[PDB]
Design a protein around this ligand. Structure first.
Ligand code: GDM
Length: 213
């Protein structure tokens, strides 16, 4: 019996939009670093719920396990990075994932225009956007203890949407789904994923698991 769902479309802040276009339209040779950025983000999120629980144990009612799961899907061509971290509220998503200017955006673009390696992205605080080196579309599903589950999404192009997620409920955390570009499918390969995690994400302070098939 026909479901009615609310959607809200937002405009990326000007420089974030320019950064996304720079990332998508320019050739870079070390694109694999996108995973290190996403895993670092998940690690950051896990630290936050970890410390918050020390002060309030009920914060783990939504789930005690603190870990990261990597899920490649060769059928629909998606690579999903999941964490049981702190998660983000609707306000968190809208504010921190597009709408508000970030201080390192310009500096990073300057660096890139000068020939800096993309690997540098994390030092500028805009590392999430490196997802667009390999994905044509990114969906961020998230659940924070203080809000309902939400889905953010963008195929770049200057806008992003936010809507309540009606997919599989998550206890708490964030799930980044990368809809990979046709020539970036190597990241759906178990050997390649293991290779890059070993190379760049060896000191993650939480267990990571790769689910194959
Ligand atoms: C201070 O921390 C970081 C910030 C500032 C700000 C966004 C923090 C955020 O505020 C709501 C939460 O406190 C934090 C726990 C959530 C994450 C890191 C999310 O990752 C997962 N898995 O939760 C990430 O994924 C969509 C969201 C935004 C990341 C952006 C825009 C980025 O490019 N760089 C950043 C890396 C950071 O470490 C960044 O901006």
């Amino acid at each position: 019996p026909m479901e009615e769902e609310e959607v809200e479309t937002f405009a990326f802040q000007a420089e974030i939009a320019q950064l996304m276009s720079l990332i998508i339209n320019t050739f870079y040779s070390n694109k694999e670093i996108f995973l290190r950025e996403l895993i670092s983000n998940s690690s950051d999120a896990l630290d936050k719920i970890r410390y918050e629980t020390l002060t309030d144990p009920s914060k783990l009612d939504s789930g005690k396990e603190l870990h990261i799961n990597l899920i490649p899907n060769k059928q629909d061509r998606t690579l999903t990075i999941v964490d049981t971290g702190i998660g983000m509220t609707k306000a968190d998503l809208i504010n921190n994932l597009g709408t508000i200017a970030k201080s390192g955006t310009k500096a990073f673009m300057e660096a890139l225009q000068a020939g800096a390696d993309i690997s540098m992205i994390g030092q500028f605080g805009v590392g999430f956007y490196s997802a667009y080196l390999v994905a044509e579309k990114v969906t961020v599903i998230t659940k924070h203890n203080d809000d309902e589950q939400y889905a953010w999404e963008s195929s770049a192009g200057g806008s992003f949407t936010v809507r309540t997620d009606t997919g599989e409920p998550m206890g708490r955390g964030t799930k980044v789904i990368l809809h990979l570009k046709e020539d970036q499918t190597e990241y759906l390969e178990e050997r390649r994923i293991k290779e890059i995690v070993k190379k760049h994400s060896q000191f993650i302070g939480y267990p990571i698991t790769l689910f194959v098939e």
